[PDB]
A paper describes a structure:
[name] TA systems are the most common Type II TA system in bacteria, and consist of a [name] [name] and [name] PIN domain-containing toxin. The [name] [name] consists of two domains, an N-terminal promoter-binding domain and a C-terminal, intrinsically disordered region, which conceals and inhibits the active site of the [name] toxin in the [name] complex. Like many Type II TA systems, [name] expression is auto-regulated at the transcriptional level through direct binding of the higher-order TA complex to two operator sites (OS1 and OS2) in its promoter. The related [name] locus on the chromosomally integrated [name] F plasmid is mutated in bacteria that are tolerant to beta-lactam antibiotics, before subsequently evolving resistance.
To investigate the structural consequences of the [name] tolerance mutations, we used X-ray crystallography to determine structures of several [name] variants in complex with [name]. In [name] hetero-octamers, two distinct SpoVT/AbrB-type DNA-binding domains are formed through dimerization of the N-terminal domains of two molecules of [name], in a “crossed fingers” configuration. Mutations that confer [name] tolerance to antibiotics map to the N terminus of [name] (VapBT3N, VapBT3N+L7P, VapBV5E, VapBL7P, VapBA13P, VapBL16R, VapBV20G, and VapBT3N+A13P+L16R) in [name] on the chromosomally integrated F plasmid. However, we noticed that the DNA-binding domain of [name] appears to be quite flexible and with low local resolution, which means that side chains are not visible in the regions containing the mutations. In conclusion, the potential tolerance mutations of [name] do not appear to affect the ability of [name] to form the canonical hetero-octameric structure.
Numbering used by the authors:
A (entry chain D), D (entry chain D): 1 to 68
B (entry chain B), C (entry chain B): 1G, 2 to 68
E (entry chain A), F (entry chain A), G (entry chain C), H (entry chain C): 1 to 132
The structure:
Amino acid sequence: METTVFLSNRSQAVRLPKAVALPENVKRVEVIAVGRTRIITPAGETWDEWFDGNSVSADFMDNREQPG
Amino acid sequence: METTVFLSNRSQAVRLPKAVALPENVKRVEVIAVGRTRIITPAGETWDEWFDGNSVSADFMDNREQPG
Amino acid sequence: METTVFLSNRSQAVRLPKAVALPENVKRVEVIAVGRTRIITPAGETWDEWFDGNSVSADFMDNREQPG
Amino acid sequence: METTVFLSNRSQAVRLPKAVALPENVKRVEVIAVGRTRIITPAGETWDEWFDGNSVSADFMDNREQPG
Amino acid sequence: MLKFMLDTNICIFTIKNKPASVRERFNLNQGRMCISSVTLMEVIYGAEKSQMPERNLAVIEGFVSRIDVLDYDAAAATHTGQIRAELALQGRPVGPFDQMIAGHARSRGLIIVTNNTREFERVGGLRIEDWS
Amino acid sequence: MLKFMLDTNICIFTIKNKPASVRERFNLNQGRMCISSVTLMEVIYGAEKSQMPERNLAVIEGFVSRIDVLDYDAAAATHTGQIRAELALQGRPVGPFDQMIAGHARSRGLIIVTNNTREFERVGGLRIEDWS
Amino acid sequence: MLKFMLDTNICIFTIKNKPASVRERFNLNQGRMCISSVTLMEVIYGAEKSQMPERNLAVIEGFVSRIDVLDYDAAAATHTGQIRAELALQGRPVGPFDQMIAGHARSRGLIIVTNNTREFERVGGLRIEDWS
Amino acid sequence: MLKFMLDTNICIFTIKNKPASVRERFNLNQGRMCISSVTLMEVIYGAEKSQMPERNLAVIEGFVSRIDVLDYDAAAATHTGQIRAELALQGRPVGPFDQMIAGHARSRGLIIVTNNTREFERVGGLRIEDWS
């Protein structure tokens, strides 16, 4: 889908039409500029970050206690 | 650079920082939804991003293996 | 008896022959879509058809076998 | 979904709201009256009819000639 | 419009025994009733475990076509997750599927309709009605 | 808006070789291009048959996200069924998937875009373009 | 909902010989049965290939009017792509149209009903039944 | 599209031990992975059962934010119902939550990713993978 570009908050901005609309959970986004094209990727998706970030505690129940 | 997602005209829209501001000539752009990543491209240059990068590996069967 | 399907107000509607005409008191009815079969019932008597017929076989486990 | 009953072609008739709307292929319909409830079934669905109706000819290709 | 969530017990009770009392309540509260997918799989299991599946499935289909089947969303999962933990700290035993049905109701703010209140009674933040 | 149906051959040709000529045509005819599900499974097969599936799939995903994938409907099946029969009476050999792509186009009245016209040329009622 | 996807093989078998056993299976599982658009084109091809097309076509039409024809979607294509690759790696041969029918079923989690169980057994993640 | 449905087992395993092997599998198949809402409630339960709930909850939240949480639909329920019955007839024991996760996958044709292959192998029509 093609939208239109507008100007707001003293910055160039673009609308995400209903089809290409992001997951509503995505509130922060990183923009990568490759030539004339812009890459909009949800800020915080690299698994390497979570795999290297904060871990759980020892209390975290290993077995699921699945009733049965 | 990172940015914020806001709502305008009852849909999602993304502010682009001046650091990642598109050429003034570019008024019409084209957004492509590849997974969670949105590819904004100047209208008429939609395939430029895909043709430039996105290299396919050599084993990619160049024939078709259609039974016949 | 058999009948015809026509279109009114941009949707489907079905003429019912006088042989199968509902009681005049019945103004509001309720249509239920079970597969290709539509069950029109007088509003407030929606479950009457299901409760009357539609007998379940005896082997139908009357307990629940919920793990616990 | 609940619709409303109307009078047309000198007969009581009912609308099929968008949700319970029949397959558009279904043009002829048989109406069975069970008490105050009406059973609307597509005229011509009994497999026993087709299994006892006209059969194909000897020319009907048994094997599919599936290319391979 | 949805106000009541029919649990598995009250459902099977109705499908198997078709009680008159439940018919009136159903006919009266038509449109404000729903079930959870958890309830669905359970009634499907019953039909599929029988020697006449197709027959029993059809009965079930009639039942389901008149109500709404709500999908177990992340909200339901979250609420149930909390719920499960709460019962653990309290040492109250509730069956798994039942735990999920309770969470699903809380997520959507629905009234649990049952014949066995004592089961759902342990969970907090739940309004229950006995339609038996 | 859709006018052109991209066949499997012209697709694989583009994904593997990324020819410049095709880029301009694509950028120009953006919005009026579509592929058949038949074409899709074929390009999926290629990616899945490779030693780097995920990498190749992503390339494909970029391609597919910019066009529309039309679903092989009963209309396509009907047209292809006729088509297959016609070729048989004429003794013209066309590959299966290709037979279906041709039918899909006829059902929707689209222009077949190919690098091998000679293949689709045998089928009648088809407008073909060579974008190679 | 739908449970079974009838293969082309099982279809042609029933249309030509109208077997009593299959009638009972049909009458028993009526409404839970469907065919793929791939199957449709094949039996259409057969009728149009026959010496009395309109005659067999009419029979074909009656049959399809009584089941559901699902459209070969992108989901089906993807699964078929996987299946195609998998079968290749193992050197297991399955016919083109059958590969697609299998994908359509797997993508939806339907049980394949066919009389050629061995061909479809090669495909993984697929439940198969012989109603002949 | 999505290919893999991560089991609760494989999830807890990764969240606690953050294994390097799984990171590569995750980084390789990123975007083609999902969990069931059934899985969500279970890991939520675990965190809320823990001695530092908010701490583990935050970890849990990060994990789910990176995959897709599919809602347990009526399709999943039906398949689980079938699975439940099938397993019973054969006397094969599978846990409640696992039964539901399997149904969710089968209904969508997804590959189950788990570390307990034996439990899920009992279920038929399901493709399983061990990413541990």
